[PDB]
Write a protein that binds this ligand. Structure first.
Ligand SMILES: Cc1cc2nc3c(=O)[nH]c(=O)nc-3n(C[C@H](O)[C@H](O)[C@H](O)COP(=O)(O)OP(=O)(O)OC[C@H]3O[C@@H](n4cnc5c(N)ncnc54)[C@H](O)[C@@H]3O)c2cc1C
Ligand SMILES: Cc1cc2nc3c(=O)[nH]c(=O)nc-3n(C[C@H](O)[C@H](O)[C@H](O)COP(=O)(O)OP(=O)(O)OC[C@H]3O[C@@H](n4cnc5c(N)ncnc54)[C@H](O)[C@@H]3O)c2cc1C
Lengths: 308, 309
């Protein structure tokens, strides 16, 4: 593809939502272009995916490869770049390096960016005991001692599921209280194998070939503890693309996510959204639901383009 | 499993939505039981599925096999039977036709819908040999071929619209003087130079040799009988939601007879969730991917409900 080319739909992103939307957009015979920065999106940080029905215990890297093969069967052009602006003048989609493209409709599958922690040992033990998704990996830590870092809904829900599989969960958070919804806190509080480690931070993640310990510091007392753990789940949340939405005149909900209706329509006619950047099923971040929302957004774009 | 046993969640159905809910329910460590009549649900009548991302060109029968394999990896017990009633006591009592009754803290309904039957001569004979019940699924296979779409609602009109982008010509056949589809769909399709409306008409027969070759059509006004050469026939006459089952079990339905759910797949009865084609969510869009995703959402709502309880 070249700058200035016009498409029926431009899909922004290259994660599950974008792949799901591209598959349906191409099969609807919409001239489709996908522009995304990172192939696979959040899946680039995942290990094995075993909750996408029908792809049993698949390495996330292989899931990305087969999702790409599926849309390439339909010859969907994929441009690796960052979309900076979406202007209505038809739409003109401006990219950082590869020019401006035109479209009758746009589907945003831009996801959310993981809030970074960055503690010593985190890079060293990537894929070696550290996980960024408790609901995905909890089944892999049956009868192991684990730590969850975080204090919102993501971390409390993570501690709840890990409490079911694991020996014990140390739930570590830097504040004096959790910010999670009260029922999540109360539910986890009643688990005898979950220990709250409030007012604390992880100073270091240590191990040999795999994670073996976390050094924890209490910010109020200075007390330092070394906990022996086999897994560390970093669950500090994700940042929605509020700035991108605001910059491009797209409404966001009061949580900062792109507001969509049932049919994945944003506040801008002709612009749809799918996946975890949206307000739909907020808080539930899964491959299957992003792929499904992509199918719905493609169907809404199809109806919009054909009726236009 | 044995009668009287209690589960955290009982999933009714064995189609995409129930498999999707069972996979998540098992992964949340919910004590799960699946009771369903037909493994695969509507997939038992599908051909090749090429719109479930990541399972490229999978035969529907192979998709049922791998969906089953996936939940059995989690040792989810599956009972092949019909659920006759869901009694709301404190807890639910799910009554089956042949396996006794079971108790549950929550229930997920993935009971789907039933395809309305046309029943024209040649239809059952040419199943899988030129007849399709899903335009969105099969349209890509009819590029540069001639097809007929039978029906008059939204699915037939949108089916014709999609097929017009692949096929050389599309005959849209319906027995009434007008279509009952949203006017916008009718107006949009009418402009296609390759779509021909064949209103006030019925198909008398679907004919072929090894595969579909013709449809015999009768015009109900003029009485004229004519044969149209076609490579494919897409029957798009709708589905029947389980309104009776919903009413029987005290579950509210939407204005179209589907199980009313909110965003999180909650029905009007606390502790009862629903997923897939039987629900009011994304009405009209009936796909494997969306049923499997709604199953995951219903399982998560059941998980939250049970853990809170
Ligand atoms: C470590 C980890 C493991 C996980 N494991 C599982 C699992 O096993 N099962 C499961 O169901 N879920 C899992 N998840 C959750 C799941 O991966 C996400 O819910 C899902 O990937 C969301 O898909 P998405 O397409 O909406 O967004 P993302 O995956 O966030 O992808 C967004 C895409 O948009 C691109 N993008 C963003 N902004 C721009 C821009 N301006 N221009 C161009 N491109 C842009 C990104 O580069 C990326 O390609 C996991 C998440 C993490 C972090
Ligand atoms: C011919 C055909 C081809 C299709 N092709 C495609 C395609 O290529 N791609 C695509 O994405 N979609 C396709 N679809 C649509 C897709 O199959 C459906 O959207 C999907 O199967 C719906 O799944 P579900 O689980 O909600 O319902 P269903 O598949 O309808 O399953 C409902 C389940 O509930 C069971 N059940 C119902 N009542 C009871 C009861 N009282 N007790 C116990 N069990 C009960 C049924 O036996 C069944 O197991 C096709 C549909 C048809 C009819």
């Amino acid at each position: 593809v070249k700058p200035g080319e016009k498409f029926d739909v431009i899909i922004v992103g290259l994660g599950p939502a974008a792949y799901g939307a591209a598959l349906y957009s191409a099969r609807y015979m919409l001239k489709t272009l996908v522009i995304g920065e990172t192939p696979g999106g959040q899946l680039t940080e995942a290990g094995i995916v075993d909750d996408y029905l029908g792809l049993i215990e698949i390495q996330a890297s292989d899931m990305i490869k087969v999702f790409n093969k599926h849309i390439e069967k339909y010859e969907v052009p994929v441009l690796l770049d960052i979309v900076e602006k979406i202007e209505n003048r038809e739409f003109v989609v401006k990219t950082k390096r590869k020019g401006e493209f035109k479209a009758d409709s746009v589907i945003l599958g831009i996801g959310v960016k993981r809030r970074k922690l960055g503690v010593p040992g985190e890079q060293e033990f990537a894929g070696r005991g550290i996980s960024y998704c408790s609901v995905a990996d909890a089944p892999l830590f049956k009868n192991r001692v684990v730590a969850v870092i975080g204090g919102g809904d993501s971390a409390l829900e993570g501690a709840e599921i890990l409490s079911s599989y694991s020996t014990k969960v140390y739930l570590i958070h830097r504040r004096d209280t959790f910010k999670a919804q009260p029922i999540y806190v109360e539910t986890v509080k009643k688990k005898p194998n979950v220990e709250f480690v409030l007012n604390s931070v992880v100073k270091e993640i240590k191990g040999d070939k795999v994670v073996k310990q976390v050094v924890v510091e209490n910010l109020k007392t200075g007390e330092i503890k070394e906990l022996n753990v086999n897994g560390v789940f970093i669950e500090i949340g994700f940042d929605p693309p509020t700035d991108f939405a605001k910059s491009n005149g797209i409404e966001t909900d009061t949580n900062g996510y792109i507001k969509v209706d049932e049919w994945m329509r944003t506040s801008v006619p002709g612009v749809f959204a799918a996946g975890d950047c949206t307000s739909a099923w907020l808080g539930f971040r899964q491959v299957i639901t992003a792929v499904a929302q992509g199918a719905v957004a493609a169907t809404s774009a199809y109806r919009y383009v054909t009726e236009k």
